[PDB]
Amino acid sequence: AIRKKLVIVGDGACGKTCLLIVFSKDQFPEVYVPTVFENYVADIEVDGKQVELALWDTAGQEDYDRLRPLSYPDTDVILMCFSIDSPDSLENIPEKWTPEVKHFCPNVPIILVGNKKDLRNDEHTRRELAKMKQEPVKPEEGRDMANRIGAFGYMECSAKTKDGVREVFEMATRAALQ
Amino acid sequence: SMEMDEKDFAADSWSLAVDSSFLQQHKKEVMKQQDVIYELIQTELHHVRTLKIMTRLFRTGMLEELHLEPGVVQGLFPCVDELSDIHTRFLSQLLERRRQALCPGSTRNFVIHRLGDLLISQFSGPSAEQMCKTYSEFCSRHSKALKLYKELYARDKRFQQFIRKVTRPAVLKRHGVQECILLVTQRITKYPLLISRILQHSHGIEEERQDLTTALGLVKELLSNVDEGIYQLEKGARLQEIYNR
Ligand SMILES: CNC(=O)c1ccc(S(N)(=O)=O)cc1
Ligand SMILES: CNC(=O)c1ccc(S(N)(=O)=O)cc1
Ligand SMILES: CNC(=O)c1ccc(S(N)(=O)=O)cc1
Ligand SMILES: CNC(=O)c1ccc(S(N)(=O)=O)cc1
Protein backbone atom coordinates (compact mmCIF):
# COMPACT_ATOMS: atom_id res chain seq x y z
CA ALA A 1 0.00 0.00 0.00
CA ILE A 2 1.18 3.55 -0.77
CA ARG A 3 1.31 6.08 2.12
CA LYS A 4 -0.49 9.46 1.78
CA LYS A 5 -0.89 12.34 4.25
CA LEU A 6 -4.12 14.27 4.91
CA VAL A 7 -4.43 17.45 6.98
CA ILE A 8 -7.71 19.17 7.94
CA VAL A 9 -7.85 22.95 8.32
CA GLY A 10 -10.62 25.40 9.28
CA ASP A 11 -11.74 27.73 12.06
CA GLY A 12 -12.06 26.52 15.66
CA ALA A 13 -15.46 24.81 16.13
CA CYS A 14 -15.81 24.03 12.36
CA GLY A 15 -16.10 20.32 13.43
CA LYS A 16 -12.73 19.10 12.07
CA THR A 17 -11.82 17.16 15.24
CA CYS A 18 -15.21 15.43 15.38
CA LEU A 19 -15.00 14.50 11.70
CA LEU A 20 -11.60 12.78 12.23
CA ILE A 21 -12.85 10.99 15.40
CA VAL A 22 -16.03 9.65 13.74
CA PHE A 23 -14.17 8.45 10.63
CA SER A 24 -11.30 6.80 12.60
CA LYS A 25 -13.66 4.95 14.97
CA ASP A 26 -16.43 4.36 12.28
CA GLN A 27 -18.91 5.61 14.95
CA PHE A 28 -20.15 8.78 16.73
CA PRO A 29 -18.99 7.91 20.32
CA GLU A 30 -21.92 6.97 22.55
CA VAL A 31 -20.21 7.42 25.93
CA TYR A 32 -17.52 10.11 25.58
CA VAL A 33 -16.57 12.31 22.64
CA PRO A 34 -12.82 13.05 22.85
CA THR A 35 -11.67 16.65 23.12
CA VAL A 36 -8.59 16.10 20.94
CA PHE A 37 -7.32 13.90 18.08
CA GLU A 38 -3.67 12.68 18.11
CA ASN A 39 -3.25 11.05 14.66
CA TYR A 40 -4.43 7.90 12.86
CA VAL A 41 -3.35 5.83 9.86
CA ALA A 42 -6.45 4.59 7.98
CA ASP A 43 -6.36 1.51 5.72
CA ILE A 44 -8.50 2.62 2.74
CA GLU A 45 -9.22 0.78 -0.52
CA VAL A 46 -10.65 3.11 -3.16
CA ASP A 47 -11.31 2.16 -6.82
CA GLY A 48 -9.14 -0.98 -6.44
CA LYS A 49 -6.15 0.88 -4.92
CA GLN A 50 -4.88 0.26 -1.36
CA VAL A 51 -3.66 3.31 0.57
CA GLU A 52 -2.41 3.99 4.14
CA LEU A 53 -3.88 7.47 4.75
CA ALA A 54 -2.30 9.31 7.71
CA LEU A 55 -4.80 11.80 9.28
CA TRP A 56 -3.85 15.03 11.08
CA ASP A 57 -5.82 17.83 12.81
CA THR A 58 -4.80 21.53 13.14
CA ALA A 59 -7.23 22.11 16.13
CA GLY A 60 -5.48 24.20 18.79
CA GLN A 61 -3.09 25.78 16.23
CA GLU A 62 -5.48 28.45 14.88
CA ASP A 63 -3.94 31.32 16.95
CA TYR A 64 -0.25 30.29 16.43
CA ASP A 65 0.94 31.37 12.97
CA ARG A 66 4.50 29.97 13.29
CA LEU A 67 3.57 26.63 14.96
CA ARG A 68 0.61 25.84 12.65
CA PRO A 69 2.56 25.50 9.32
CA LEU A 70 4.69 22.72 10.89
CA SER A 71 1.58 20.50 10.28
CA TYR A 72 1.87 21.03 6.43
CA PRO A 73 5.17 19.34 5.20
CA ASP A 74 4.51 16.63 2.57
CA THR A 75 0.72 16.88 2.73
CA ASP A 76 -0.93 15.02 -0.21
CA VAL A 77 -4.54 16.28 0.32
CA ILE A 78 -6.12 19.11 2.32
CA LEU A 79 -9.64 19.01 3.73
CA MET A 80 -10.66 22.67 4.19
CA CYS A 81 -13.58 22.74 6.61
CA PHE A 82 -16.35 25.16 7.54
CA SER A 83 -19.52 24.60 9.56
CA ILE A 84 -22.92 24.91 7.77
CA ASP A 85 -24.35 26.46 11.01
CA SER A 86 -21.67 29.22 10.82
CA PRO A 87 -21.73 31.52 7.74
CA ASP A 88 -18.73 33.37 9.38
CA SER A 89 -16.60 30.14 9.15
CA LEU A 90 -17.22 30.24 5.33
CA GLU A 91 -16.15 33.94 4.98
CA ASN A 92 -12.66 33.12 6.45
CA ILE A 93 -12.05 30.46 3.77
CA PRO A 94 -11.00 32.71 0.81
CA GLU A 95 -8.80 35.34 2.46
CA LYS A 96 -7.25 33.44 5.44
CA TRP A 97 -7.14 29.64 4.94
CA THR A 98 -6.85 29.50 1.14
CA PRO A 99 -3.76 31.79 0.76
CA GLU A 100 -2.05 29.94 3.65
CA VAL A 101 -2.63 26.45 2.21
CA LYS A 102 -1.63 27.56 -1.32
CA HIS A 103 1.65 28.99 0.04
CA PHE A 104 2.74 25.99 2.19
CA CYS A 105 1.10 23.23 0.05
CA PRO A 106 1.50 24.36 -3.61
CA ASN A 107 -0.32 22.08 -6.08
CA VAL A 108 -1.93 20.02 -3.27
CA PRO A 109 -5.65 19.35 -3.93
CA ILE A 110 -8.07 21.02 -1.55
CA ILE A 111 -11.51 19.61 -0.90
CA LEU A 112 -13.87 22.19 0.61
CA VAL A 113 -16.08 20.39 3.17
CA GLY A 114 -19.29 21.74 4.69
CA ASN A 115 -19.56 20.08 8.13
CA LYS A 116 -22.65 19.70 10.44
CA LYS A 117 -25.05 19.51 7.44
CA ASP A 118 -27.73 18.14 9.86
CA LEU A 119 -28.04 21.68 11.36
CA ARG A 120 -29.47 23.08 8.08
CA ASN A 121 -32.92 21.80 9.23
CA ASP A 122 -32.43 22.35 13.00
CA GLU A 123 -34.93 24.91 14.38
CA HIS A 124 -32.69 26.10 17.27
CA THR A 125 -29.91 26.83 14.72
CA ARG A 126 -32.27 28.73 12.37
CA ARG A 127 -33.63 30.83 15.28
CA GLU A 128 -30.14 31.72 16.62
CA LEU A 129 -28.83 32.66 13.16
CA ALA A 130 -32.00 34.71 12.32
CA LYS A 131 -31.21 37.02 15.29
CA MET A 132 -27.94 38.05 13.49
CA LYS A 133 -29.77 38.42 10.09
CA GLN A 134 -28.26 35.07 9.01
CA GLU A 135 -29.25 31.59 7.78
CA PRO A 136 -27.40 28.21 7.52
CA VAL A 137 -25.00 28.01 4.54
CA LYS A 138 -26.91 26.98 1.38
CA PRO A 139 -25.49 24.18 -0.87
CA GLU A 140 -24.92 26.64 -3.77
CA GLU A 141 -23.02 29.01 -1.43
CA GLY A 142 -20.66 26.14 -0.52
CA ARG A 143 -20.21 25.05 -4.19
CA ASP A 144 -19.57 28.67 -5.30
CA MET A 145 -16.91 29.18 -2.63
CA ALA A 146 -15.19 25.91 -3.62
CA ASN A 147 -15.32 26.97 -7.31
CA ARG A 148 -13.90 30.45 -6.45
CA ILE A 149 -10.96 29.17 -4.33
CA GLY A 150 -9.82 26.59 -6.96
CA ALA A 151 -10.84 23.56 -4.86
CA PHE A 152 -10.64 20.04 -6.34
CA GLY A 153 -14.28 19.67 -5.25
CA TYR A 154 -17.06 20.44 -2.75
CA MET A 155 -18.57 17.92 -0.31
CA GLU A 156 -20.92 17.97 2.72
CA CYS A 157 -21.17 15.68 5.74
CA SER A 158 -22.54 15.24 9.23
CA ALA A 159 -20.21 13.78 11.91
CA LYS A 160 -23.28 13.46 14.23
CA THR A 161 -25.22 11.11 11.90
CA LYS A 162 -22.08 9.83 9.97
CA ASP A 163 -23.81 10.75 6.65
CA GLY A 164 -21.26 11.55 3.98
CA VAL A 165 -18.22 10.92 6.20
CA ARG A 166 -16.92 7.79 4.44
CA GLU A 167 -17.37 9.47 1.01
CA VAL A 168 -15.28 12.49 2.08
CA PHE A 169 -12.28 10.30 3.04
CA GLU A 170 -12.62 8.01 -0.03
CA MET A 171 -12.61 11.09 -2.32
CA ALA A 172 -9.68 12.61 -0.34
CA THR A 173 -7.73 9.36 -1.02
CA ARG A 174 -8.51 9.57 -4.77
CA ALA A 175 -7.36 13.26 -4.80
CA ALA A 176 -4.13 12.31 -2.94
CA LEU A 177 -3.42 9.63 -5.60
CA GLN A 178 -3.85 12.00 -8.60
CA SER B 1 4.43 2.48 28.50
CA MET B 2 4.32 0.08 31.46
CA GLU B 3 1.51 -2.48 31.74
CA MET B 4 0.13 -1.09 35.03
CA ASP B 5 -0.50 2.39 33.51
CA GLU B 6 -1.71 1.01 30.15
CA LYS B 7 -4.40 -1.06 31.91
CA ASP B 8 -5.43 1.90 34.13
CA PHE B 9 -5.90 4.02 30.96
CA ALA B 10 -7.20 1.24 28.59
CA ALA B 11 -10.87 2.37 28.78
CA ASP B 12 -12.31 5.01 26.39
CA SER B 13 -13.35 7.17 29.36
CA TRP B 14 -13.23 7.59 33.18
CA SER B 15 -16.91 6.46 33.32
CA LEU B 16 -15.88 3.13 31.66
CA ALA B 17 -12.56 2.80 33.66
CA VAL B 18 -14.14 2.93 37.19
CA ASP B 19 -16.48 0.17 38.55
CA SER B 20 -20.15 0.84 37.60
CA SER B 21 -21.12 0.70 41.32
CA PHE B 22 -18.60 3.53 41.98
CA LEU B 23 -19.78 5.58 38.92
CA GLN B 24 -23.39 5.47 40.18
CA GLN B 25 -22.44 7.27 43.41
CA HIS B 26 -21.44 10.49 41.55
CA LYS B 27 -23.33 13.39 40.01
CA LYS B 28 -23.27 13.81 36.20
CA GLU B 29 -21.20 17.04 36.46
CA VAL B 30 -18.47 15.13 38.40
CA MET B 31 -18.45 12.37 35.75
CA LYS B 32 -18.10 14.99 32.93
CA GLN B 33 -15.19 16.69 34.77
CA GLN B 34 -13.40 13.32 35.47
CA ASP B 35 -13.85 12.09 31.86
CA VAL B 36 -11.82 15.15 30.58
CA ILE B 37 -9.14 14.84 33.34
CA TYR B 38 -8.82 11.15 32.35
CA GLU B 39 -8.34 12.20 28.68
CA LEU B 40 -5.58 14.68 29.68
CA ILE B 41 -3.68 11.96 31.64
CA GLN B 42 -4.29 9.27 28.99
CA THR B 43 -2.98 11.55 26.15
CA GLU B 44 0.00 12.55 28.38
CA LEU B 45 0.83 8.81 28.94
CA HIS B 46 0.71 8.34 25.08
CA HIS B 47 2.88 11.47 24.52
CA VAL B 48 5.54 10.16 26.95
CA ARG B 49 5.32 6.80 25.08
CA THR B 50 5.92 8.66 21.73
CA LEU B 51 9.05 10.22 23.30
CA LYS B 52 10.26 6.76 24.49
CA ILE B 53 9.83 5.38 20.91
CA MET B 54 12.02 8.28 19.68
CA THR B 55 14.75 7.90 22.38
CA ARG B 56 14.83 4.11 22.86
CA LEU B 57 13.64 2.52 19.62
CA PHE B 58 14.92 5.00 16.99
CA ARG B 59 17.74 7.12 18.46
CA THR B 60 19.47 4.40 20.51
CA GLY B 61 18.80 1.77 17.80
CA MET B 62 20.60 3.93 15.22
CA LEU B 63 23.55 4.54 17.59
CA GLU B 64 23.84 0.79 18.30
CA GLU B 65 23.20 -0.71 14.80
CA LEU B 66 24.22 1.98 12.25
CA HIS B 67 27.44 3.89 11.39
CA LEU B 68 25.92 7.36 10.95
CA GLU B 69 28.26 10.37 10.85
CA PRO B 70 28.51 12.38 14.14
CA GLY B 71 25.69 14.89 14.72
CA VAL B 72 23.31 13.09 12.32
CA VAL B 73 21.36 11.26 15.07
CA GLN B 74 21.05 14.54 17.06
CA GLY B 75 19.75 16.26 13.88
CA LEU B 76 17.06 13.58 13.46
CA PHE B 77 15.94 13.69 17.14
CA PRO B 78 16.57 17.23 18.47
CA CYS B 79 15.92 17.79 22.26
CA VAL B 80 14.42 14.31 22.77
CA ASP B 81 16.22 13.67 26.13
CA GLU B 82 15.12 17.09 27.50
CA LEU B 83 11.52 16.60 26.25
CA SER B 84 11.41 13.10 27.79
CA ASP B 85 12.61 14.50 31.17
CA ILE B 86 10.00 17.32 31.18
CA HIS B 87 7.03 15.10 30.26
CA THR B 88 8.04 11.97 32.25
CA ARG B 89 8.21 14.18 35.40
CA PHE B 90 4.84 15.80 34.57
CA LEU B 91 3.25 12.38 33.91
CA SER B 92 4.71 11.10 37.24
CA GLN B 93 2.91 13.95 39.11
CA LEU B 94 -0.42 13.33 37.25
CA LEU B 95 -0.29 9.55 37.98
CA GLU B 96 0.67 10.14 41.66
CA ARG B 97 -2.35 12.53 42.07
CA ARG B 98 -4.62 9.76 40.65
CA ARG B 99 -3.00 7.05 42.83
CA GLN B 100 -3.35 9.08 46.10
CA ALA B 101 -7.06 9.63 45.21
CA LEU B 102 -7.83 5.83 44.88
CA CYS B 103 -10.31 4.38 47.37
CA PRO B 104 -8.78 1.82 49.77
CA GLY B 105 -9.34 -1.67 48.35
CA SER B 106 -9.39 -0.39 44.75
CA THR B 107 -6.86 0.14 41.97
CA ARG B 108 -9.37 1.92 39.64
CA ASN B 109 -11.88 3.97 41.63
CA PHE B 110 -10.83 7.62 42.21
CA VAL B 111 -11.94 11.24 41.75
CA ILE B 112 -9.37 14.02 41.16
CA HIS B 113 -10.81 17.19 42.72
CA ARG B 114 -7.61 19.38 42.69
CA LEU B 115 -5.89 19.34 39.26
CA GLY B 116 -5.51 23.16 38.89
CA ASP B 117 -2.65 23.49 41.41
CA LEU B 118 -0.61 20.78 39.64
CA LEU B 119 -1.11 22.55 36.26
CA ILE B 120 -0.11 25.98 37.72
CA SER B 121 3.09 24.37 39.08
CA GLN B 122 3.88 22.68 35.73
CA PHE B 123 3.22 25.86 33.65
CA SER B 124 5.05 28.36 35.97
CA GLY B 125 8.61 28.80 37.34
CA PRO B 126 11.70 26.93 36.10
CA SER B 127 9.70 24.00 34.64
CA ALA B 128 7.76 26.48 32.40
CA GLU B 129 11.00 28.29 31.37
CA GLN B 130 12.51 24.89 30.41
CA MET B 131 9.35 23.95 28.42
CA CYS B 132 9.52 27.28 26.54
CA LYS B 133 13.27 26.94 25.74
CA THR B 134 13.01 23.27 24.73
CA TYR B 135 9.92 23.64 22.42
CA SER B 136 11.35 26.84 20.87
CA GLU B 137 14.50 24.79 19.96
CA PHE B 138 12.54 21.62 18.94
CA CYS B 139 9.99 23.38 16.74
CA SER B 140 12.78 25.47 15.06
CA ARG B 141 14.63 22.18 14.20
CA HIS B 142 11.51 20.23 13.11
CA SER B 143 11.76 20.82 9.31
CA LYS B 144 15.52 20.07 9.29
CA ALA B 145 14.87 16.76 11.11
CA LEU B 146 12.23 15.72 8.49
CA LYS B 147 14.55 16.62 5.56
CA LEU B 148 17.51 14.73 7.10
CA TYR B 149 15.23 11.69 7.59
CA LYS B 150 13.99 11.73 3.96
CA GLU B 151 17.55 12.10 2.63
CA LEU B 152 18.89 9.17 4.71
CA TYR B 153 15.89 6.89 3.87
CA ALA B 154 16.29 7.56 0.10
CA ARG B 155 20.09 7.11 -0.08
CA ASP B 156 21.22 4.69 2.69
CA LYS B 157 20.32 0.98 2.35
CA ARG B 158 21.22 0.02 5.98
CA PHE B 159 19.20 3.06 7.26
CA GLN B 160 16.18 2.01 5.12
CA GLN B 161 16.41 -1.61 6.35
CA PHE B 162 16.65 -0.37 9.99
CA ILE B 163 13.56 1.87 9.64
CA ARG B 164 11.49 -0.80 7.86
CA LYS B 165 12.49 -3.36 10.53
CA VAL B 166 11.62 -1.35 13.67
CA THR B 167 8.43 0.21 12.21
CA ARG B 168 7.02 -3.12 10.87
CA PRO B 169 4.98 -4.11 13.99
CA ALA B 170 1.31 -3.10 13.91
CA VAL B 171 1.73 -1.23 17.27
CA LEU B 172 4.09 1.25 15.46
CA LYS B 173 1.55 1.97 12.61
CA ARG B 174 1.04 5.64 13.74
CA HIS B 175 4.62 6.13 14.98
CA GLY B 176 7.10 6.41 12.13
CA VAL B 177 9.92 9.01 12.56
CA GLN B 178 8.10 11.90 10.83
CA GLU B 179 4.83 11.03 12.64
CA CYS B 180 6.62 11.14 16.07
CA ILE B 181 8.13 14.58 15.26
CA LEU B 182 4.72 16.06 14.34
CA LEU B 183 2.99 14.37 17.36
CA VAL B 184 5.50 16.14 19.65
CA THR B 185 5.15 19.57 17.95
CA GLN B 186 1.33 19.27 18.17
CA ARG B 187 1.28 18.22 21.87
CA ILE B 188 1.62 21.69 23.34
CA THR B 189 -1.37 23.09 21.44
CA LYS B 190 -3.65 20.30 22.84
CA TYR B 191 -3.28 21.62 26.45
CA PRO B 192 -5.61 24.71 26.22
CA LEU B 193 -8.33 22.58 24.55
CA LEU B 194 -8.22 19.95 27.35
CA ILE B 195 -7.89 22.53 30.19
CA SER B 196 -10.77 24.69 28.86
CA ARG B 197 -13.09 21.65 28.77
CA ILE B 198 -12.01 20.56 32.33
CA LEU B 199 -12.66 24.17 33.50
CA GLN B 200 -16.16 24.08 31.91
CA HIS B 201 -17.05 21.28 34.42
CA SER B 202 -15.12 22.65 37.47
CA HIS B 203 -17.41 25.43 38.72
CA GLY B 204 -18.58 23.53 41.87
CA ILE B 205 -15.50 24.60 43.87
CA GLU B 206 -14.57 28.27 43.31
CA GLU B 207 -10.89 27.66 44.34
CA GLU B 208 -10.66 24.99 41.55
CA ARG B 209 -12.34 27.16 38.86
CA GLN B 210 -9.87 29.97 39.72
CA ASP B 211 -6.82 27.63 39.68
CA LEU B 212 -7.78 26.14 36.27
CA THR B 213 -8.38 29.69 34.91
CA THR B 214 -4.85 30.66 36.09
CA ALA B 215 -3.40 27.44 34.53
CA LEU B 216 -5.14 28.13 31.18
CA GLY B 217 -3.57 31.64 31.14
CA LEU B 218 -0.06 30.22 31.87
CA VAL B 219 -0.38 27.59 29.09
CA LYS B 220 -1.42 30.35 26.62
CA GLU B 221 1.60 32.45 27.71
CA LEU B 222 3.90 29.41 27.03
CA LEU B 223 2.34 28.93 23.54
CA SER B 224 2.57 32.62 22.64
CA ASN B 225 6.30 32.66 23.66
CA VAL B 226 7.14 29.44 21.80
CA ASP B 227 5.30 30.69 18.67
CA GLU B 228 7.28 33.99 18.77
CA GLY B 229 10.60 32.17 19.31
CA ILE B 230 10.44 29.89 16.25
CA TYR B 231 12.54 30.39 13.10
CA GLN B 232 13.02 27.29 10.82
CA LEU B 233 16.65 26.15 10.64
CA GLU B 234 17.78 24.86 7.24
CA LYS B 235 20.89 22.80 6.54
CA GLY B 236 23.24 24.88 4.36
CA ALA B 237 21.35 28.16 4.91
CA ARG B 238 23.48 31.21 4.16
CA LEU B 239 23.82 34.20 6.50
CA GLN B 240 22.45 36.51 3.76
CA GLU B 241 19.20 34.44 3.56
CA ILE B 242 18.94 34.68 7.39
CA TYR B 243 19.50 38.44 7.90
CA ASN B 244 17.14 39.19 4.94
CA ARG B 245 14.20 37.43 6.74
C1 LIG C 1 -23.04 15.17 22.27
N1 LIG C 1 -21.78 15.77 21.86
C2 LIG C 1 -20.70 15.97 22.82
O1 LIG C 1 -20.80 15.62 23.95
C3 LIG C 1 -19.38 16.58 22.34
C4 LIG C 1 -18.34 16.74 23.23
C5 LIG C 1 -17.13 17.26 22.79
C6 LIG C 1 -16.98 17.60 21.46
S1 LIG C 1 -15.40 18.29 20.90
N2 LIG C 1 -14.46 18.67 22.27
O2 LIG C 1 -15.63 19.50 20.09
O3 LIG C 1 -14.70 17.41 19.95
C7 LIG C 1 -18.03 17.43 20.56
C8 LIG C 1 -19.23 16.91 21.00
C1 LIG D 1 -16.26 -3.78 -0.45
N1 LIG D 1 -17.18 -3.57 0.66
C2 LIG D 1 -17.09 -2.54 1.69
O1 LIG D 1 -17.93 -2.53 2.53
C3 LIG D 1 -16.01 -1.46 1.81
C4 LIG D 1 -16.13 -0.57 2.86
C5 LIG D 1 -15.20 0.44 3.05
C6 LIG D 1 -14.13 0.55 2.18
S1 LIG D 1 -12.89 1.86 2.40
N2 LIG D 1 -12.89 2.80 0.99
O2 LIG D 1 -11.56 1.29 2.63
O3 LIG D 1 -13.11 2.67 3.60
C7 LIG D 1 -13.99 -0.34 1.14
C8 LIG D 1 -14.93 -1.34 0.94
C1 LIG E 1 8.57 27.18 11.14
N1 LIG E 1 7.97 26.68 9.91
C2 LIG E 1 8.65 25.64 9.16
O1 LIG E 1 9.66 25.17 9.56
C3 LIG E 1 8.02 25.07 7.89
C4 LIG E 1 6.65 25.06 7.76
C5 LIG E 1 6.08 24.52 6.63
C6 LIG E 1 6.87 23.98 5.63
S1 LIG E 1 6.11 23.27 4.15
N2 LIG E 1 4.51 22.81 4.42
O2 LIG E 1 6.92 22.14 3.65
O3 LIG E 1 6.17 24.22 3.02
C7 LIG E 1 8.25 23.98 5.76
C8 LIG E 1 8.83 24.56 6.88
C1 LIG F 1 4.24 33.35 37.23
N1 LIG F 1 4.60 33.01 35.86
C2 LIG F 1 5.74 32.17 35.60
O1 LIG F 1 6.37 31.71 36.50
C3 LIG F 1 6.07 31.82 34.15
C4 LIG F 1 7.31 31.30 33.82
C5 LIG F 1 7.56 30.96 32.49
C6 LIG F 1 6.59 31.15 31.52
S1 LIG F 1 6.96 30.69 29.81
N2 LIG F 1 8.62 30.86 29.57
O2 LIG F 1 6.10 31.38 28.86
O3 LIG F 1 6.54 29.27 29.59
C7 LIG F 1 5.34 31.66 31.87
C8 LIG F 1 5.09 31.99 33.19
Swiss-Prot record, chain A:
5-glutamyl serotonin modifications at: 61
Source species of the chain: Homo sapiens
Outcome recorded upon mutating residue 133 to R: Reduced FBXL19-mediated ubiquitination and subsequent degradation
Effect of residue 69 to S: In EDFAOB; somatic mosaic variant; decreased Rho protein signal transduction; decreased substrate adhesion-dependent cell spreading; decreased stress fibers assembly; decreased cytoplasmic microtubule organization
Name the UniProt record assigns to this protein: Transforming protein RhoA
SUPFAM superfamilies, sorted: P-loop containing nucleoside triphosphate hydrolases
Renumbered residue ranges of the record's region Switch II region: 59-76
Residue interval(s) of motif Effector region: 32-40
Gene that specifies this protein: RHOA
Cross-link type Glycyl lysine isopeptide (Lys-Gly) (interchain with G-Cter in ubiquitin), residue numbers: 133
Listed PROSITE patterns: RHO (PS51420)
Cleaved signal peptide residues: none
Activity regulation, short description: Regulated by guanine nucleotide exchange factors (GEFs) which promote the exchange of bound GDP for free GTP, GTPase activating proteins (GAPs) which increase the GTP hydrolysis activity and GDP dissociation inhibitors which inhibit the dissociation of the nucleotide from the GTPase. Activated by GEFs such as ARHGEF2, ARHGEF3, ARHGEF28 and BCR. Inhibited by GAPs such as ARHGAP30. Inhibited by GDP dissociation inhibitors such as ARHGDIA.
Effect on the protein of changing residue 12 to V: Increased Rho protein signal transduction. Constitutively active
E.C. numbers: 3.6.5.2
Matches recorded under SMART domains: RAB, RAS, RHO
Residues found modified as (Microbial infection) O-AMP-tyrosine: 32
Cofactor entry: Mg(2+)
GO molecular function terms noted in the UniProt entry: G protein activity; GTP binding; GTPase activity; myosin binding; protein kinase binding
Substrates-to-products reaction catalysed: GTP + H2O = GDP + phosphate + H(+)
Free-text note regarding domains: (Microbial infection) The basic-rich region is essential for yopT recognition and cleavage.
The keyword Glycoprotein belongs to this UniProt entry's keyword annotation: yes
CDD domains registered for this protein in UniProt: RhoA_like
Residues with the (Microbial infection) ADP-ribosylasparagine modification: 39
Cellular localisation: Cell membrane; Cytoplasm, Cytoskeleton; Cleavage furrow; Cytoplasm, Cell cortex
Documented effect of changing residue 32 to A: Abolishes interaction with DGKQ
Alphabetically ordered keywords of this record: ADP-ribosylation, Cell cycle, Cell division, Cell membrane, Cell projection, Cytoplasm, Cytoskeleton, Disease variant, Ectodermal dysplasia, Glycoprotein, GTP-binding, Host-virus interaction, Hydrolase, Isopeptide bond, Lipoprotein, Magnesium, Membrane, Methylation, Nucleotide-binding, Nucleus, Phosphoprotein, Prenylation, Proto-oncogene, Ubl conjugation
From Swiss-Prot, chain B:
Subcellular location: Cytoplasm, Cytoskeleton; Cytoplasm; Cell junction, Tight junction; Golgi apparatus
Domain remark text: The DH (DBL-homology) domain interacts with and promotes loading of GTP on RhoA. Promotes tyrosine phosphorylation of RIPK2.
Sequence intervals crossing the membrane: none
Function: Activates Rho-GTPases by promoting the exchange of GDP for GTP. May be involved in epithelial barrier permeability, cell motility and polarization, dendritic spine morphology, antigen presentation, leukemic cell differentiation, cell cycle regulation, innate immune response, and cancer. Binds Rac-GTPases, but does not seem to promote nucleotide exchange activity toward Rac-GTPases, which was uniquely reported in PubMed:9857026. May stimulate instead the cortical activity of Rac. Inactive toward CDC42, TC10, or Ras-GTPases.
Disease the record associates with this protein: Neurodevelopmental disorder with midbrain and hindbrain malformations: An autosomal recessive neurodevelopmental disorder characterized by intellectual disability, speech delay, mild microcephaly, midbrain-hindbrain malformations, and variable dysmorphic features.
Whole sequence portion shown: 206 to 448 of 986
Post-translational changes noted in the entry: Phosphorylated by AURKA and CDK1 during mitosis, which negatively regulates its activity. Phosphorylation by MAPK1 or MAPK3 increases nucleotide exchange activity. Phosphorylation by PAK4 releases GEF-H1 from the microtubules. Phosphorylated on serine, threonine and tyrosine residues in a RIPK2-dependent manner.
Domain (DH) ranges: 32-229
Protein name per Swiss-Prot or TrEMBL: Rho guanine nucleotide exchange factor 2
